Amino acid sequence: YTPVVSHRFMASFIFNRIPDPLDIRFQRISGLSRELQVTQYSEGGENARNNYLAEKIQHGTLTLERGVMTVSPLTWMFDRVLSGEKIAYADVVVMLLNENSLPLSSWTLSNALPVRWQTSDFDANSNAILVNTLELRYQDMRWLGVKI
Amino acid sequence: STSTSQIAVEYPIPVYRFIVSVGDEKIPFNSVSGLDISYDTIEYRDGVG
């Protein structure tokens, strides 16, 4: 039918089956890619058409940046795991939104491990928002709804 | 009632009477324009401001 636009979205986190509804305001989210790795096997007298053998599926890496805000249960989670205290998992629910703020489709990203966390640079010469480019690696992705 | 010697020291001077000397020659021109003294600017801002 008709396509949808890419500037309404919210992403909520699930810290140990306890939802996190304070941290849904993000600047951008990376867009979710998955890829089936493929080993090409060429053989014998068949030298006019390829022959591709499937392999394991390689999921992408989810980056999402936000303006730096007051400290929140999202920020206490990344600071806990990137200071070497506790390696813990967090589930991410990324959903599109309608005009009536209803979800079109949602991606649930099970057991996403927070990998890196990077702020923007200070500079005195230009005016811009300090952002928090924080990037986390998920190990499964289960698309759910209508209008994928 | 100003005199002609106060005009020559107070009143400003008009453009329509000038002589140009190119090297050692005197060539009578009509309109000379575009001479100026310009500089560029360097800004430096740091931290506390």
SS3 for A81? helix
Question: CA A93, CA A106: separation in Å to the nearest integer?
Answer: 7
CA atoms within 13 A on the CB side of B44: 1
In chain A, which residue's Cα lies nearest the Cα of B46? A124
* Count of Cβ atoms closer than 10 Å to residue A65 Cβ: 19
* Count of Cβ atoms closer than 10 Å to residue A32 Cβ: 15
Evaluate whether A105 touches A121 at the Cβ level (below 8 Å): no
How many interface pairs between A and B have CB atoms less than 8 angstroms apart? 5
Chain A positions in Cβ-Cβ contact with residue B47 (cut-off 8 Å): 124
Question: CA B21, CA A33: separation in Å to the nearest integer?
Answer: 76
To what resolution in angstroms was this structure determined?
3.5
Evaluate whether A28 touches A64 at the Cβ level (below 8 Å): yes
Tokens encoding A72: 């929140």
Q: How was this structure determined?
A: cryo-EM
- Alpha carbon distances (Å) from A128 to A25, A70, A125, A146, B26: 18, 18, 10, 37, 59
Could you give phi then psi for residue A95, rounded to 5 degrees?
-130, 145
Tokens encoding A103: 């979800």
